[PDB]
DNA sequence: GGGCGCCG
DNA sequence: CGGCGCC
């Protein structure tokens with residue numbers, strides 16, 4: 001029965017291609033949107049020119065409409081049958097360590113399932129191995145109360161080695177969310193500052209410590225600044241493996257760090273992006289005027305997150321507000 | 325946007 | 333050493 005059936009069908013097929021074969025969210029979005037609106041319409045759609053009228057649809061859609069009208073065809077649309085690589089690839093990407101590039105290669109060699117991975121372990125680099133090892137684990141968000149305990153344990157043991165050590169937990173957590181992807185933690189130490197730019201050792205000790213207590217349980221990397229690894233809560237008879245990140249910022253550049261580690265990522269993007277519009281360039285370490293020629297001037301002093309915002313002419317926004 | 329570590 | 337995956 002349904003008049004515009006035929007069309008809406010196409011339309012929807014179309015959006016999902018746009019959705020997957022691309023990023024083309026904007027496209028896909030109008031796409032469905034439209035199919036939706038033509039769909040609510042109570043008259044048979046005859047002319048694409050009629051369609052246009054209806055809100056949601058426009059030129060580009062109306063065209064696609066036409067080509068369908070005369071002939072069920074849609075050469076573009078016919079093209080579609082290319083399929084399957086794309087489904088599987090992305091999937092693989094869900095694997096921590098697996099980027100689009102290693103995902104491709106993995107698919108080309110026929111590895112393109114979860115099951116398959118497990119079978120082709122030998123092809124995986126270490127990180128991948130882990131992502132793979134703790135796969136199901138990595139898909140669960142940490143709940144507030146958990147982080148809590150973790151905040152605790154980190155907090156504590158940090159003190160034991162030195163109580164001069166400062167540890168702040170950023171990212172989601174700090175922005176107040178109810179569930180957090182991982183645990184992100186800023187670490188600082190006054191012995192360490194913009195003048196020395198050394199002491200990998202501080203971080204170093206600390207991971208070993210947590211390590212030596214069965215907290216961290218794996219290691220994805222260990223720089224003289226960064227640190228990503230797995231960790232886990234304890235119990236009697238167990239808690240899911242979590243992703244952990246430590247970053248050591250020279251005690252003197254704590255604020256740039258804090259801002260940056262709090263995110264959100266989008267926020268940072270907009271913000272950093274903005275500093276520029278204003279003439280300064282911001283990194284986890286500093287905010288320094290950015291010179292006429294296009295080179296970084298000396299770094300403006302910072303005494304609190306507020307000041308960063310003051311510089312780019314922006315209203316301070318609480319962490320909980322830095323969503324974007 | 326701006327940058328850290330590891331791959332091979 | 334680039335480039336990758338990640339933050």
Ligand SMILES: Nc1ccn([C@H]2CC[C@@H](COP(=O)(O)OP(=O)(O)OP(=O)(O)O)O2)c(=O)n1
Nearest residue numbers: 171172180181182260261262263264265268339
């Ligand atoms: N591409 C990125 C990623 C992060 N940052 C910052 C934002 C905070 C931290 C990223 O931590 P994530 O754990 O990626 O984000 P989150 O806020 O912790 O989110 P989740 O809930 O997923 O852990 O690095 C940035 O400037 N650019």
Ligand SMILES: [Mg+2]
Nearest residue numbers: 171172182184
């Ligand atoms: Mg987080």
Ligand SMILES: [Mg+2]
Nearest residue numbers: 182183184245
């Ligand atoms: Mg993280």
